[PDB]
Write an enzyme that holds these catalytic residues in place. Structure first.
Site, PDB file in Angstrom:
ATOM      1  CD  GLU A   1      -2.964  -0.949   0.195  1.00 55.98           C
ATOM      2  OE1 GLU A   1      -3.847  -1.726   0.040  1.00 55.98           O
ATOM      3  OE2 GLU A   1      -2.965   0.200  -0.414  1.00 55.98           O
TER       4      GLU A   1
ATOM      5  CG  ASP B   1      -7.959   4.122  -4.342  1.00 58.53           C
ATOM      6  OD1 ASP B   1      -8.632   3.379  -3.661  1.00 58.53           O
ATOM      7  OD2 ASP B   1      -8.399   4.613  -5.473  1.00 58.53           O
TER       8      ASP B   1
END
Ligand SMILES: [Cl-]
Ligand SMILES: [Cl-]
Length: 162
Positions: free
Chosen positions: A11, A20
């Site tokens: 991540e 994202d």
């Protein structure tokens, strides 16, 4: 290696709001704030998550704090899911972390529809599951990360992350 290091690798860590891979506002170690296109909305959810007026920036400690809660949340979601629990309970420790990674990324929902892969995993048919898992939008959108997770289910080792 463990679930925490593994996810921190998948991540990354960012201390200002960012979008994202799906274009949604996120912060920290993959902590999704909102699916809304509104930055204000996002900044509002963040301040509510943190308990202060952040102005779209948090510290490292704060990020790690969200991260822990999110990991805890993912696990507990798995344990409460009738379709997933039995799978999870059937797996070894390394493979459990791979299942948590998927849930953390896609939500209980998302994962709970890999029905067929889940059965295969429960049966310990690793190569087969690895092929079935790849036939997914998930693999086609984030192939590198998907490959790391898929290798982990296939081998039961952390080689993909070392
Ligand atoms: Cl929160
Ligand atoms: Cl990827």
């Amino acid at each position: 290696m463990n679930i925490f290091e593994m996810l921190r690798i998948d991540e990354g860590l960012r201390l200002k709001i960012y979008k994202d891979t799906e274009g949604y506002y996120t912060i920290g170690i993959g902590h999704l704030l909102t699916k809304s296109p509104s930055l204000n909305a996002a900044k509002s959810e963040l301040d509510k998550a943190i308990g202060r007026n952040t102005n779209g920036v948090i510290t490292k400690d704060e990020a790690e704090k969200l991260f822990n809660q999110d990991v805890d949340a993912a696990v507990r979601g798995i344990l409460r899911n009738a379709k997933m629990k039995p799978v999870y309970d059937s797996l070894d420790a390394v493979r459990r972390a791979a299942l948590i990674n998927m849930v953390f990324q896609m939500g209980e929902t998302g994962v709970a529809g890999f029905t067929n892969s889940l059965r295969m995993l429960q049966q310990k048919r690793w190569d087969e599951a690895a092929v079935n898992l790849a036939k997914s939008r998930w693999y086609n959108q984030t192939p590198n990360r998907a490959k790391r997770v898929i290798t982990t289910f296939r081998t039961g080792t952390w080689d993909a992350y070392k």
